[PDB]
């Protein structure tokens, strides 16, 4: 799996967004556009995340 680390808190705005906290590790499910990816959190919740707010995590 591909993972990213949150650089900032993301409260989200829209129903489809996946909120997260600074430092969280998120799994990338797919990449429907350049700056918004579909991710999954450790609780199994899914949604859109802003790519500028994350870093590759390996």
């Amino acid at each position: 799996a591909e993972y990213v680390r949150a650089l900032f808190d993301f409260n989200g705005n829209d129903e489809e967004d996946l909120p997260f906290k600074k430092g969280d590790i998120l799994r990338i499910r797919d990449k429907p556009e350049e700056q918004w990816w579909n991710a999954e959190d450790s609780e199994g919740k899914r949604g859109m995340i802003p790519v500028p707010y994350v870093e590759k995590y390996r």
């Binding site: 900032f8 705005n13 829209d14 429907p32 556009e33 350049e34 700056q35 918004w36 859109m48 802003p50 790519v51 500028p52 707010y53």
Partner: peptide, 13 residues
């Protein structure tokens, strides 16, 4: 680096 603004959503099918 700071906190970049939230990116626009392109919302393409």
């Amino acid at each position: 680096y700071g906190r970049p603004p939230l990116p626009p959503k392109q919302k393409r099918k």
